[PDB]
Design a protein around this ligand. Sequence first.
Ligand SMILES: CC1=C(/C=C/C(C)=C/C=C/C(C)=C/C=C/C=C(C)/C=C/C=C(C)/C=C/C2=C(C)CCCC2(C)C)C(C)(C)CCC1
Lengths: 222, 42, 84, 742
Amino acid sequence: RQLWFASKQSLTYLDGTLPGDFGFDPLGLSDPEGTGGFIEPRWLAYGEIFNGRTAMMGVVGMIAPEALGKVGLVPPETAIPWFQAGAIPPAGTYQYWADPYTLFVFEMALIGFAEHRRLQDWYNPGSMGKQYFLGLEKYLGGSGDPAYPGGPIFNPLGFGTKSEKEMKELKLKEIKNGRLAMLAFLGMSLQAIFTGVGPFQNLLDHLSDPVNNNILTSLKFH
Amino acid sequence: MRDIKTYLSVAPVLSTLWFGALAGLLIEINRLFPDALSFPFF
Amino acid sequence: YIGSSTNLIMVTTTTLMLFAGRFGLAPSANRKATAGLKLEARESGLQTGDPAGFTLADTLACGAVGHIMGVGIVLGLKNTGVLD
Amino acid sequence: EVKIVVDRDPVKTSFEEWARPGHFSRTLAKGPDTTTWIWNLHADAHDFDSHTGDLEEISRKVFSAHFGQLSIIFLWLSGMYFHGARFSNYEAWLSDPTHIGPSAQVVWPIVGQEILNGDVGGGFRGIQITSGFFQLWRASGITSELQLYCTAIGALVFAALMLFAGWFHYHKAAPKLAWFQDVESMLNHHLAGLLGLGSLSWAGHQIHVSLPINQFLDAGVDPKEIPLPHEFILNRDLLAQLYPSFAEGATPFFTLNWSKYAEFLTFRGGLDPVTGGLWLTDIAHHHLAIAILFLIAGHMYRTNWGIGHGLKDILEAHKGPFTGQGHKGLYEILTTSWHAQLSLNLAMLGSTTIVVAHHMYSMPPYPYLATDYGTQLSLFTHHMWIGGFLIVGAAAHAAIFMVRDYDPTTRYNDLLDRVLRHRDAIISHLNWVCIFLGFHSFGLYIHNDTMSALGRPQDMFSDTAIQLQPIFAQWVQNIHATAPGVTAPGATTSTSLTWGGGELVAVGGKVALLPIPLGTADFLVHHIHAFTIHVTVLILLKGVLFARSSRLIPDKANLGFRFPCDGPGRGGTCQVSAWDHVFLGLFWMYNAISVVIFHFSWKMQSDVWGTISDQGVVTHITGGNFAQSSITINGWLRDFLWAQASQVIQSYGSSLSAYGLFFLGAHFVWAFSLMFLFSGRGYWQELIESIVWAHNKLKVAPATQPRALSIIQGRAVGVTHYLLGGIATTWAFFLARIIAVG
Ligand SMILES: CC1=C(/C=C/C(C)=C/C=C/C(C)=C/C=C/C=C(C)/C=C/C=C(C)/C=C/C2=C(C)CCCC2(C)C)C(C)(C)CCC1
């Protein structure tokens, strides 16, 4: 428990239940005097896991296309900053294999399917392996805890061989990489809101010229 | 369900709907017979 | 534009405020002042790395007050140019 | 310390109760043996504190009720914005607002009321409005019906959301005591969070949307090709074209050389001749400075951390020699009795509403507002009425607290104890002051009227006769007109124009504001106001101080808050409950507000409002006869009450004809009130008895045994009808007169 900016209302409930408790919570949210719905410590660990994972995937993906465009062979047809890809209309757009809006509602419906089923599992664990699902039924029981589902659909290669220690390592790795990807995503987006040129080009910049130091300018522009 | 039925049978709401229907009937008659002063049928 | 009036004023005010905190010259997180004197330090329960018990609140409150007193003592700049 | 503790699912959302009325009251739930049951049912619905004995449940109930109220308010706002969108001429009004009457309500052509849709100009027909929304919608740069439409939609969404939140917080996740009773964090937030950030975000919406579009409209452009708001923030070059400084991003702010922004944040003061309104730069600077002030204020009290005060640690220190122990323990009183808080907040809210009413007319914030006469007048008088009602409610609930939840054994105090220990002195001296003011402020009018009707004008009270001069008011006005010279250099003119110095602001051949002189008539009217206010205070303060126990009835409190009397014994004991004290004070508050609003109307239409000639000669709407005809009651009849009641009485067969009709019904109810206020009960009981006989003779006697209203309910219905009649009369009078002439 490497104490970085802790408090006592943190230690009221942060007693070391989350894998690798570092003790950093000044505010003391999940005090268990009255358990707030969705403020449950279980729900908090669940949320940090899910958010960090999504942030890992996002920091890989948003940066992938243009970056690869640099000295790679993904065409310049998509050499566009993630914040200019089209998600931000005041930045850019693109002609796709559908129209914008219906595409968005369609992907929303799909992600909704997935996350609704996951939440229903959260309420009643294991309870997805009962109803007809056109197959897939004998897999979605999970590994008990909705935090960690397991299953050969989500455990292909096979790790944590005969172990909980290996799972503890792999998993610390999980929390650390999630937090790092969170930081990197937030930084890319803040540069984008204040710089206006794109992350990978910002690396192109900060490889040679040290004098950049654009906190000195603090120039706020689109 | 039956509770909401007995509640709906409480005089305020019944009276409001009855009066609304009556007023609608009257205003529709007035629309279809403007100014209707006399009894010009017999 | 570094080291000028604004810089020197802000830095000296904030550093003297933080020193008044950390040395016992400010009524910070674990010190409540009475009508008169100040040295009535009592605990809140916010143990942090600081050797004198300085949480992440007093080290922010003292900073806010230092910046406010700085802005106030400087934007009375009626003798060093109304525009800088 | 302080946490998020709540409880789960006390009461289930089951319709089991809706079919059983009066489930809350044990007696009410039994059944209506008579007809007074259905009065007593409504009469005690919201009476939460008589339904339990613990503050947790009533606190939960009021938490849900606040959500109900907010849902109703949001629905009202949505209806307003909708009717502005789909049924107004708002675009035509924006085209040129000088001589186009704001109309926002049309009527269906069914029963001859087509005449209601009178001529309002701009190719429209509709009932003219005076709510004054249009000045706001032009301040916020709405300038498009799509905006009104989507705003109404969002308001409906928020209304449904609040209703949900209500249902959920009462039924599913009920808050607990240590949450409610924790006022430190509530003050902390509401100071810093709600008000401050509110004004800050509004300053945002003004500097980034309103200011440019308003400046463009003042330059004069059809709002069709006026650039959309978001196209003023996305592409910077527009604002760059407007304000050079504004094209410098954020360096001049962070680097402490704020003077660069001087263009759009300034301290000009005065009004803007292009629209008579306020310089939006000024109001933006105001809202922003206020935001910063509330934010720095919000950080007072210790909540969870080690810094900050405690509302218990502040009172007990104050303890003076005369009073003794000071405010010790008062913190517990104002945390253990809702009615106390309701009274305090209602008093402060009424006072704030009154001061808003005042500050409105003398400093028109909106643009093209000080030239739509009826709007200004109606707004002012509405705010005045709301303030009066809030104050009376404050006094009533203070009395209720005094009766029920006050007790020295555990909710002790040494300040209120002293106050009550010498109540007689307070009431006596206030009574004598009331007599003194009554005499020397009304007998003056009587003397003046008499010495007028006796052909002795040179023995009158006026400027042309024995003279009374309001010297202090003119002194203050001189100071306010010479203050921007030395004391407040950063300003440009006086804070407003009504101060006795400067020029006049006139737009579209009509004047909006100019200096205001005070004559002896103003002295007299001010003393009338002071007297009537003192008498209302006397009534209500006597009620509160004597709600516990009087020297007439020794144990009044035991008899409860609201009871009719204590029998005709000891020479008669009618109207001794504090409830009846409030019943009395209501009429006097009505009278105070009525005379105040009459004075305002006459003074404005006789010294400020009116038209301006091409050369610059002013001919006020009424001719400026105030200082010579406000000093005789017979004058008030002749010059103001009779004369300016023309436009309402010839109003038949015109657009304004509705304002005519009410002018009678308003009076009628007004009559009707007397029937309840004068009679008693036993007479009506015997009459009802004979009627029950007449029916029973025909096998029609209803089991819901008829009963003449109880005494207290009789007084209540009487006072309600009377207030309704009076306020509706003055309402019709005002609207008809001002909207016809002006
Ligand atoms: C020695 C040492 C140390 C220390 C250091 C230091 C000294 C630091 C500093 C720090 C700091 C230095 C902090 C600060 C803070 C500050 C703040 C936090 C501020 C804030 C501000 C603000 C928020 C502002 C506001 C405003 C505005 C915005 C406008 C209006 C006005 C005013 C002013 C109000 C350490 C710990 C490392 C370790 C041990 C050793």
